[PDB]
Amino acid sequence: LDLKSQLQELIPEQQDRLKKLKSEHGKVQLGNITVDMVIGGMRGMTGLLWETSLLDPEEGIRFRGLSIPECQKVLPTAQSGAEPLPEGLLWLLLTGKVPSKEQVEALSKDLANRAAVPDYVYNAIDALPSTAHPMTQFASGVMALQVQSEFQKAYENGIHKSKFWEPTYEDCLNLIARVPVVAAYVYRRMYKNGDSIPSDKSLDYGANFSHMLGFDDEKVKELMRLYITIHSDHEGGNVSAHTGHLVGSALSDPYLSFAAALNGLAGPLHGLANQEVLLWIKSVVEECGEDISKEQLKEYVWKTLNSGKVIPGYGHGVLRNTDPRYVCQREFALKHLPDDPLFQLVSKLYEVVPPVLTELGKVKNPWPNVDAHSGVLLNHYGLTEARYYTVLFGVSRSLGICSQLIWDRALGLALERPKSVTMDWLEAHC
Amino acid sequence: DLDLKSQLQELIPEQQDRLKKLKSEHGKVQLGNITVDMVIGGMRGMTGLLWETSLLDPEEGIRFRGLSIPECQKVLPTAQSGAEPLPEGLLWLLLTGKVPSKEQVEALSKDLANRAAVPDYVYNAIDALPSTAHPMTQFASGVMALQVQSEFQKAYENGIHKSKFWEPTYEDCLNLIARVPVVAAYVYRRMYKNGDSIPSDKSLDYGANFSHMLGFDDEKVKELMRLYITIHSDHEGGNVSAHTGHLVGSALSDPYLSFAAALNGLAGPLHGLANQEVLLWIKSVVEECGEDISKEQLKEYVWKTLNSGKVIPGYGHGVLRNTDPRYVCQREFALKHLPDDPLFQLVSKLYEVVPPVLTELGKVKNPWPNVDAHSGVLLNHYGLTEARYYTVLFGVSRSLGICSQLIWDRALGLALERPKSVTMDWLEAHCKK
Numbered sequence: 001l002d003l004k005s006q007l008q009e010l011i012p013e014q015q016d017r018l019k020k021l022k023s024e025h026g027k028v029q030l031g032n033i034t035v036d037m038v039i040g041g042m043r044g045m046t047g048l049l050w051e052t053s054l055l056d057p058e059e060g061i062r063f064r065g066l067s068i069p070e071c072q073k074v075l076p077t078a079q080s081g082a083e084p085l086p087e088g089l090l091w092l093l094l095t096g097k098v099p100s101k102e103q104v105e106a107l108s109k110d111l112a113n114r115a116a117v118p119d120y121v122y123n124a125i126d127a128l129p130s131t132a133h134p135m136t137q138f139a140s141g142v143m144a145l146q147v148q149s150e151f152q153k154a155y156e157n158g159i160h161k162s163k164f165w166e167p168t169y170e171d172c173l174n175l176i177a178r179v180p181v182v183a184a185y186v187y188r189r190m191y192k193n194g195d196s197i198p199s200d201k202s203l204d205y206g207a208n209f210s211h212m213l214g215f216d217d218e219k220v221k222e223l224m225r226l227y228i229t230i231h232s233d234h235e236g237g238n239v240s241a242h243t244g245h246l247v248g249s250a251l252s253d254p255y256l257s258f259a260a261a262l263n264g265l266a267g268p269l270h271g272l273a274n275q276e277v278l279l280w281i282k283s284v285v286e287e288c289g290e291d292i293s294k295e296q297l298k299e300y301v302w303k304t305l306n307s308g309k310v311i312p313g314y315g316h317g318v319l320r321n322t323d324p325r326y327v328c329q330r331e332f333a334l335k336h337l338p339d340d341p342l343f344q345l346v347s348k349l350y351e352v353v354p355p356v357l358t359e360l361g362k363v364k365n366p367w368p369n370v371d372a373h374s375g376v377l378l379n380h381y382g383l384t385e386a387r388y389y390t391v392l393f394g395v396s397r398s399l400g401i402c403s404q405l406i407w408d409r410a411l412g413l414a415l416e417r418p419k420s421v422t423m424d425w426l427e428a429h430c
Numbered sequence: 431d432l433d434l435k436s437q438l439q440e441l442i443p444e445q446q447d448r449l450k451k452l453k454s455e456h457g458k459v460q461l462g463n464i465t466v467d468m469v470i471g472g473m474r475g476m477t478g479l480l481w482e483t484s485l486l487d488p489e490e491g492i493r494f495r496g497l498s499i500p501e502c503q504k505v506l507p508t509a510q511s512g513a514e515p516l517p518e519g520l521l522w523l524l525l526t527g528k529v530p531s532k533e534q535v536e537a538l539s540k541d542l543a544n545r546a547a548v549p550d551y552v553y554n555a556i557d558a559l560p561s562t563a564h565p566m567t568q569f570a571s572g573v574m575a576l577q578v579q580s581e582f583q584k585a586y587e588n589g590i591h592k593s594k595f596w597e598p599t600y601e602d603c604l605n606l607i608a609r610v611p612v613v614a615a616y617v618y619r620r621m622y623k624n625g626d627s628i629p630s631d632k633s634l635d636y637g638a639n640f641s642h643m644l645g646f647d648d649e650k651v652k653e654l655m656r657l658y659i660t661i662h663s664d665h666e667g668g669n670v671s672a673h674t675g676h677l678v679g680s681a682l683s684d685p686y687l688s689f690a691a692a693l694n695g696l697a698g699p700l701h702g703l704a705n706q707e708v709l710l711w712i713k714s715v716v717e718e719c720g721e722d723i724s725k726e727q728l729k730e731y732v733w734k735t736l737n738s739g740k741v742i743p744g745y746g747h748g749v750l751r752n753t754d755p756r757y758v759c760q761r762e763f764a765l766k767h768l769p770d771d772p773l774f775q776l777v778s779k780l781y782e783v784v785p786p787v788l789t790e791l792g793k794v795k796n797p798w799p800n801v802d803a804h805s806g807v808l809l810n811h812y813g814l815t816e817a818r819y820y821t822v823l824f825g826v827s828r829s830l831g832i833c834s835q836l837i838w839d840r841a842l843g844l845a846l847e848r849p850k851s852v853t854m855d856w857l858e859a860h861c862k863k
């Protein structure tokens with residue numbers, strides 16, 4: 001029933017698993033370090049341990065071994081709702097076990113009680129100019145939340161190393177609860193003239209975020225519940241997850257690690273694909289009309305690709321099949337907005353471009369990912385401010401990042417210290 | 431030529447060719463092995479990233495572009511009537527790889543002083559936080575406020591070419607380096623001097639202006655800050671703060687975002703508290719044993735202390751067979767400017783007593799101290815006693831090395847950092863075959 005007690009029971013076995021990996025297989029070779037990897041951003045280098053999720057090359061991303069369709073099947077939904085609740089996903093990442101309906105409701109009320117945000121967090125955000133990037137205002141608010149960090153004081157008070165995960169657990173669960181309040185406050189300030197909406201402790205996680213953003217529609221709540229769940233985690237190799245794990249390895253509290261993760265997530269090469277697709281889709285509907293045939297779209301897709309241009313959300317795939325996170329958002333749109341013209345162009349692109357990409361032979365995997373479909377769903381219901389979309393990404397990704405940060409302290413993972421070299425050193429070795 | 435950006439523009443194409451040739455000829459050359467111990471131990475022993483501004487010599491210590499600290503002290507220009515190397519000249523060395531003239535250092539000093547303008551909402555952002563907030567938090571939150579004026583964010587939004595990424599990166603870094611002391615000094619005056627803020631002086635050099643804004647106008651403190659900023663400026667890229675900024679920068683985040691994230695890693699107890707731990711420990715030793723402790727009484731204390739399962743702060747943490755040259759150069763300063771300071775005498779006596787004791791016990795590889803065992807008594811002697819703030823001084827200094835590499839990261843067009851992640855299920859499946 002209680003998440004901290006469930007984690008306490010499950011920790012010792014994985015600790016024993018870790019010791020056996022050192023004792024039995026510590027010298028087992030996983031690959032070779034080459035000059036290509038040191039200069040090419042660790043490309044092809046197995047470098048870190050991330051337990052909460054791993055990418056299956058056949059079934060897509062797996063949250064603790066459960067694929068996206070498996071998650072939709074067994075994760076509890078809200079009463080009067082049909083999409084998997086983000087609380088149940090959070091339970092899965094931390095414990096590895098699918099939660100009951102009662103455990104999700106207990107976790108939902110737990111999150112609602114931890115969502116208190118002190119006034120100096122709002123003061124910190126409001127002190128920034130209106131021109132500040134929403135990711136900057138978001139990250140600055142997280143830095144203000146760091147003042148109430150319980151792991152910082154516990155470490156200063158000399159808590160035992162085997163107890164590090166307990167205040168990390170408290171800070172993470174507090175962070176996960178409070179980050180939507182900060183994220184929605186940034187949204188209301190930039191677009192709703194500071195007309196902030198207080199948190200409702202009766203609602204679940206995704207619905208309370210949608211409510212604080214200014215969207216009380218039940219279908220938007222369903223959209224936000226599904227959005228937070230599917231963007232929650234994706235290995236530890238990405239910049240945001242790696243950053244928080246890297247800052248956390250120095251025994252910084254989760255607020256500092258996640259705030260640093262946001263600065264990495266704010267990178268154009270990391271957290272803007274959602275915005276690139278939506279802006280591109282809107283310009284295509286203006287250039288080619290609303291009801292463009294698939295064959296005229298095929299000629300458009302072919303000319304764009306041969307002109308040296310790419311189709312946003314396409315070509316970036318490392319899966320033999322389409323990203324299951326793309327498919328589930330298509331299922332959502334097919335049920336709740338089939339007449340939306342922007343989705344209709346997304347749907348036609350789903351049919352037309354993958355064959356074109358295969359015929360051109362310039363790209364390995366011609367299938368889209370989740371970023372090719374999330375824009376039209378948010379835009380349809382009124383969340384049109386694409387520049388804010390990375391803030392929504394941050395709220396969801398906090399669930400995966402905080403889950404691994406807890407096991408980093410539960411497993412007692414050491415400080416991350418890759419060795420550095422210079423071009424003089426590499427040339428001297430060759 | 432007194433133009434720093436033009437010097438960088440001339441030197442970039444050769445370094446780009448060095449990288450391209452390194453891939454074509456030696457891209458497939460093996461540098462080591464990936465093992466399970468390394469993946470589970472935070473990439474310990476794994477050569478993973480490229481850091482050009484410095485590299486550690488196992489015999490001569492850390493080298494700034496191939497120049498050790500004593501070598502740097504000889505050729506780097508100093509202030510008028512002063513002996514410590516100016517951080518501006520060190521910054522020139524890190525950026526260009528060449529030792530600057532006295533005039534080039536002066537040109538960069540006025541350049542930095544002119545870029546040090548800080549808008550009022552940065553102070554508002556910091557003051558919104560409570561006074562009890564950690565100094566690294568108020569500093570990092572202030573750095574986030576400086577990010578609003580980022581020129582690389584706007585330049586990328588306006589679609590500048592990839593081959594010109596370094597130009598707005600250069601502007602942001604020098605702007606960041608110029609203003610980061612202003613924010614850092616404001617945090618110091620706010621937390622410990624009741625908000626009695628001191629404005630920047632455009633006549634002073636970099637290290638002198640920082641000491642001036644912190645509230646220390648004495649020439650001997652300025653000399654200390656010039657030496658402090660210079661020797662802590664950079665130290666490879668494997669440490670958390672340098673790696674973090676490089677990691678956030680690889681996603682094409684501007685230097686303000688990379689440095690603010692770097693500070694959050696630098697605030698980690700395993701990264702930026704060695705300076706604070708040493709000063710607090712020695713002050714407790716002088717209180718437990720009196721002010722004027724003999725060298726033989728310290729051996730008796732150190733022997734009981736080490737045999738009780740305790741450690742001596744600043745000692746044993748060395749990866750150099752000899753003493754860290756950054757410790758030695760600060761010992762030179764203290765032997766010349768404060769030999770009668772009782773706290774330094776304890777550090778000096780520990781320098782004589784502790785290395786022999788540690789070797790007899792055989793538990794430690796290198797029994798020599800590092801820079802963090804000596805910087806505390808220098809700051810504390812002159813009035814900078816707030817040890818909890820010391821990591822902010824570390825951050826201001828380390829911005830010089832981090833920003834210098836961040837410019838070359840875009841100059842060299844280094845790609846996104848994408849190490850592959852695995853789980854224990856995957857590792858166990860890979861070991862059963």
Ligand SMILES: [Cl-]
Nearest residue numbers: 233234238270
């Ligand atoms: Cl991702």
Ligand SMILES: [Cl-]
Nearest residue numbers: 664665669701
């Ligand atoms: Cl260091």
